[PDB]
Amino acid sequence: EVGTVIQVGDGIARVHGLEKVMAGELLEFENGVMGMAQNLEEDNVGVVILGPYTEIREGTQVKRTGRIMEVPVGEALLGRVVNPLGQPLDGRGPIETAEYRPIESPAPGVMDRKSVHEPLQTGIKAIDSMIPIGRGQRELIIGDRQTGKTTIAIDTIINQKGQDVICIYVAIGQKQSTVAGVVETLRQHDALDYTIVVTASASEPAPLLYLAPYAGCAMGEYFMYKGKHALVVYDDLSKQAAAYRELSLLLRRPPGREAYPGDVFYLHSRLLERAAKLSDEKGGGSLTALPFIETQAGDVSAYIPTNVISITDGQIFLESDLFYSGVRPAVNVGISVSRVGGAAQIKAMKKVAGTLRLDLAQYRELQAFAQFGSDLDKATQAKLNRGERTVEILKQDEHKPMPVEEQVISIYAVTNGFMDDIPVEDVRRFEEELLSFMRANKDSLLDHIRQTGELPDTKELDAAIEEFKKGFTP
Amino acid sequence: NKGRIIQVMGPVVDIQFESGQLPDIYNAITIERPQGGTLTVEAAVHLGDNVVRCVAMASTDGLVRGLEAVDTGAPISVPVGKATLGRVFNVLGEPIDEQGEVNAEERHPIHRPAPEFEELSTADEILETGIKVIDLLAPYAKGGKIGLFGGAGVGKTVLIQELINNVAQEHGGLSVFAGVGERTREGNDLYHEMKDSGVISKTSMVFGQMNEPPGARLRVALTGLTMAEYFRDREGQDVLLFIDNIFRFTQAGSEVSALLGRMPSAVGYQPTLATEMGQLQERITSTKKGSITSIQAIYVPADDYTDPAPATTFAHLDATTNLERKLAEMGIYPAVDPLASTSRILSPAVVGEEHYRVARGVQQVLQRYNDLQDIIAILGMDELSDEDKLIVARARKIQRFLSQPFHVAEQFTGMPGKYVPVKETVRGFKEILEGKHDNLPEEAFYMVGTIDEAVEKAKKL
Amino acid sequence: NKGRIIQVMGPVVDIQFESGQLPDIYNAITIERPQGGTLTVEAAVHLGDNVVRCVAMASTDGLVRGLEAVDTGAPISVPVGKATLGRVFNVLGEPIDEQGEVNAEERHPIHRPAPEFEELSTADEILETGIKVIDLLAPYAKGGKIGLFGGAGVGKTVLIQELINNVAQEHGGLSVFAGVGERTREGNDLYHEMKDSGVISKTSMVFGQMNEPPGARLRVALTGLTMAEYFRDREGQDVLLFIDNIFRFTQAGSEVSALLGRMPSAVGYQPTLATEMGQLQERITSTKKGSITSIQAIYVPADDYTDPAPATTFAHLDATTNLERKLAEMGIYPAVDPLASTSRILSPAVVGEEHYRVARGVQQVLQRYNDLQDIIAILGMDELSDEDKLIVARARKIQRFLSQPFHVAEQFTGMPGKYVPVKETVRGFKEILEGKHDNLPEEAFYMVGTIDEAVEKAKKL
Amino acid sequence: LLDAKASEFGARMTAMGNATDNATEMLETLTLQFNRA
Question: Where does ATP bind (chain A) (predicted)?
Answer without folding.
Answer: 143-150
